[PDB]
Amino acid sequence: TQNPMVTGTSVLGVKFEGGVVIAADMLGSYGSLARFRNISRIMRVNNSTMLGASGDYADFQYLKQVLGQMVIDEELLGDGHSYSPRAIHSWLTRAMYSRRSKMNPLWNTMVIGGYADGESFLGYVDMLGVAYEAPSLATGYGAYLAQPLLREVLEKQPVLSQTEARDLVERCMRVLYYRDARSYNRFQIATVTEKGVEIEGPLSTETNWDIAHMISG
Amino acid sequence: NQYDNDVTVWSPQGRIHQIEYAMEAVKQGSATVGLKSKTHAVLVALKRAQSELAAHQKKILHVDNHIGISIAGLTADARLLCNFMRQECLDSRFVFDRPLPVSRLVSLIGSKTQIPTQRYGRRPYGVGLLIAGYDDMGPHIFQTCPSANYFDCRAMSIGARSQSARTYLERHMSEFMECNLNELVKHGLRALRETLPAEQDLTTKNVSIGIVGKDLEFTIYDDDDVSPFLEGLEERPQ
Amino acid sequence: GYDLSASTFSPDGRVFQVEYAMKAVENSSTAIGIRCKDGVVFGVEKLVLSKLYEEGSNKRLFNVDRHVGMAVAGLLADARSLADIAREEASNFRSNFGYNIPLKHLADRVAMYVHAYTLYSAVRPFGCSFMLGSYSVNDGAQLYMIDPSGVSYGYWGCAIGKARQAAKTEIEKLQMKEMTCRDIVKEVAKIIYIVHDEVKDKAFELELSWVGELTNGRHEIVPKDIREEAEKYAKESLKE
């Protein structure tokens, strides 16, 4: 993929006590056109891992197809071994570096969340193979708009609850719908705990437009 | 009689005799023993020297920080398969940054050795392996066969005169689980001693030990690092 | 002679290598499979040669997909290989067409891979027969068996191995088209206990697997509480 055609904007991520949460809008934009408005960009990887992606949706479908068969083939052996989230993270970093090195990249930037053996995982991988780990992520214009809100809370309270993390996520999406132009007020949230991967349906933020009456004000 | 000179030929009774003959090459190597507790997995071998004034042949090999093998059969097949294992483990650490499970390595070994059994112009691998490792499912002991078959085991001995060690292990299986490391190594050494004549006994020169566990990478103890494990053996009469 | 290659005919149009490869299946332990009204059930007579082998070694029931199971009898390395081929067939099918492979189609694709080994001088035929079994809401329950020659037929009940005759003579008694899976489990265990001979070979393990409504098109090993409840019925029905 040398140029993207149908794209997805920011994905968010933040840890909490006993899990991770990811959020992403349900839009695929064709340039400046909102063309597909009920696509899911969050993926149901095995019960310890989930995935969300920004960028070219076709490449995200390709990865959705490959990882699915990987996980299936892992399940078919039946021997008590499963791919941790860190393994999926490393495999994606390799898969994108190898495509970068052939100049046929995968035009994606994604957020991996997981929970295994009591510790949480949140990971990043770019088109080029740049990967890292943080308690808070945001791709695209999220990195300018939302991540300042996540970090400011995680320096005054490094350990969060599921409820506070959900509130913070919804606040960040409220800001992204305001100041990003390729956004949409219908999004999904996915969460990992010991219970596993639980995706929520189309969610909307309530928006305030009181500043519109300040012409003379 | 005359369905024997090729591996792609069945007999009227439904057998391939070249594979059965390759299995007889494991009986030509020195004896090895493998056993496991719930925390550790042990391999003890008995090394053999060609000339008296030379060094003893090395029987145990390092494959990764959590897997190791002891070999009985042809040396060349062992040296090829060990180099296969090592690269298959490096390939797993490179991609996933995790250690490769042992079941998924022995499955690959079987898939590899199955080809010479079916296509002509290649020889069956005349080497048997006992594979000791430790992963997220505990300790493991695996036997691998020239027939491209493999078994998961509580304990096993292979090589010349290994039925004695097998008979020993078969009546002490009920103890190995809650045994500590010293007792487990001693059971292995006694099963190995049961393969010798009454003339000979175990010695620093002709004993190698390989251990892997939760808090222990695969280490090998060869000549003077073995003498802690020998101290404690009852001097058996006959 | 006329019986040393699979590229060779005899004066009466027979290929004896392919028959000698079936002679190897006849000398292996017995597996059966029965197609119920709402699923399929596999049972295997798993022999334990030594007490040093763990409980779970030499598994002869394989998961080839998340809706397909496989039971084998013959050479076991050959069976593991053919399982690996049956897995990449179903993998590439989903990769190219985007849905789960049917079993009539998977059976054909594996049968042809097996038949290709009956034509050449550089290879022998496979030394294993095997059954496949699936369940779907549209396609329903299905059971196919594949032989070394490359033949593939559908079944309501089938057996492979030593006690093939003795096992089908018991399976025809069953009115399998009326019953459910939990009731056919008892029958599967009963047949495996009837045909097993303790004097001809040592103790054995019973190995079972399922696919149907009660697993939601997911091929599963039978739980322990049901396998024991069927092994008990097998013992109590041996009073005959």
Added chain:
Amino acid sequence: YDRGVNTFSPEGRLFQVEYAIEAIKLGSTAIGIQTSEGVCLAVEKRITSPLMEPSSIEKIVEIDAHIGCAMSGLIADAKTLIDKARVETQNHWFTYNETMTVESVTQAVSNLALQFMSRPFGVALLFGGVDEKGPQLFHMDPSGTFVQCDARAIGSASEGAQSSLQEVYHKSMTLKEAIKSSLIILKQVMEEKLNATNIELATVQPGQNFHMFTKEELEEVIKDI
């Protein structure tokens, strides 16, 4: 079962690989001895005519400034494996900028015997050199089997020479004494008058490189016999 290297005997044997071993006894005998002062190598040349220049009979060769080889068996196999060892010792220098050990040279040269080329190599080699671990002597066999040895004899009269080394060897020797012992053993397995053209001799000490002896240095040890 005897012909072909892809065919097992009913007892699990490879008779072609053993017949490759039997091709070593058709070569003249060579001896290698360890010592904490260094290693020695001593061989018979088997000159067939006074017309042939015996310096064109390469039975001891330099692999590097710290490793020397002695061979017995087929000439072609030896040329191949010696070129392999020389190339590997320098690829190692190019990559890591250090000296390969004798164990690793032997390990890398034995890996070609693990390739059925369609025929086993009909040649055995002794590798004598000095490493971080001191002087080391190794022995490679057509099966690709290699092992450290304190003293080893290969070739025609390997049995008697080995049956003498086990008596004259101890792990306290000097190099001048081991050189004397090797030539005394070599004297007894020859129906030709030992002289300074019927033998080669080399040494590899720690503070000195590989050094093949000369006619002068050879005669000055033949005299004390």
Added chain:
Amino acid sequence: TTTLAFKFRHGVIVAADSRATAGAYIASQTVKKVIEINPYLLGTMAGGAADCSFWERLLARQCRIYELRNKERISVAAASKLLANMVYQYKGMGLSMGTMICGWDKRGPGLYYVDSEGNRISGATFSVGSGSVYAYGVMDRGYSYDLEVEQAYDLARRAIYQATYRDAYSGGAVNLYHVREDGWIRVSSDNVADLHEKYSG
């Protein structure tokens, strides 16, 4: 960068700067630009340091194998044509190398200039780098095949000094070698700030 080499009665002299540079920044001032290929051959570095080092180490790897196979030390012309034919297979791909091969063989003192473009020239005077033009003058007015050894040392030292004085990408120390029939020998490593004092007053 500045290198020079001339062959005279008593062998070949080799001198060089010690500076490396990435644009305007001075990364290193302790660089060994004379490459000890073998105990009987010397090289130089000008252009791609990674190209100079890699391909001359590869040259050493072939020279040693030559000596082992043939039991004779290679010639200087052969050693030069190996390198030339090796770097000619990467012509236009973007290698940058300028290097002199110096040594003594059965023909006498030898000096050969090899470039990645494909030049291969024999001569009695060469200089390579940005400061080559500033060394050529001094080394041309001061040359004589009948020079003495200390005079040759002084000439090379002062030519490198005068080249470092003007050129901006040249400086540091002056590492001087001497090729002979018994191999080569390192002579000096003199900081330019030292020689400034003695050659001023």
Added chain:
Amino acid sequence: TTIMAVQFDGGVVLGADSRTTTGSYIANRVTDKLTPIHDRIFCCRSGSAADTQAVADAVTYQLGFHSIELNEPPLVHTAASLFKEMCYRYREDLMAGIIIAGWDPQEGGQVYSVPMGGMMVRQSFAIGGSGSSYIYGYVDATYREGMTKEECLQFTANALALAMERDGSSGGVIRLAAIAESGVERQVLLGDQIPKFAVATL
């Protein structure tokens, strides 16, 4: 180009214009951009004619072989997936926008759009081409779930008429097609049959 597809309970409806341009010259004014892949699976074709025609022929080959060797009628998802693999594996070499509409016993009437990059997504109504930009609002303000065959034909004709009236690279004839278990009906609207809308005079 202006292509369009709609699903109702029984099956689907398809629609397309008839213009093929080379710059501003109309090379073919009676083009047939509807294409039978199978008995009950159709393709609405947009983009480069060469690339899309070739992809259609290849997918027809694939699906015929597949359906004969299975001996059951193929799915719409299957053809859509083959289109996806070809349009994604050769996305740097093809300019191909596709809509796949048809009927299948398992899931019934289905609509799958496969834009240039080769992503696939099921839809209730799908519009594609160069004139869809001018009717993205009309089809959103007029679509209603629960429409029958005739109401969907009306909807699809009214939309394409507008897209043809405004788009320069679209015009001529509205080629419709309805697909269901019974069969495949095909209409051709031309002249006064094409819907007319008020053009302001003041």
Added chain:
Amino acid sequence: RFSPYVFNGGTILAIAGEDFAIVASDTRLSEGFSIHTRDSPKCYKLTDKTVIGCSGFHGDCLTLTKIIEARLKMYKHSNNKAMTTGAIAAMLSTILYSRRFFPYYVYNIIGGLDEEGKGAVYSFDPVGSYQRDSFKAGGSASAMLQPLLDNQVGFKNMQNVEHVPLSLDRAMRLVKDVFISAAERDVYTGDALRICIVTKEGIREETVSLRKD
């Protein structure tokens, strides 16, 4: 259009002594004018005697270290010993020239112990030209750190001075003083300072905070 490189900040430093060796780095990772994370150290332990620093494009930093870790195990398998600092350096010199026409945009510094216990520092280019040194800086602030090291370690442009050898306690204070100043003028030098000391007894680590601006 697609450019396959990006500069993710980074700064690395190494000093050698007679019985020790330090390799230090910042922990900030950047992307243009933004900050990815403030916990991403550029130092990696290879053996008990050797440490490496890596700065530049982060994908190559991740790939190359894995390649090195996979080559160390192969060396140990074939030669039955762990590698030396010079052998690792000369191997990396070839691993880098393997990509002479598509290089690893990585600035490398190795720091460890010689074979008699002395310190050793090897500095690399992206294409494998290496150089043993006493001290070297690398990364975005390399132009800012090396003058003060030339002064306070090499004793350059300072007359009538005590040419005392650098002890560990002095070197560590010096290492902290240079990052404290590079965090004031360089915008890529960031949040924390990791310092990995190498000695005959093993390898330590120390974290020291810097200003988050």
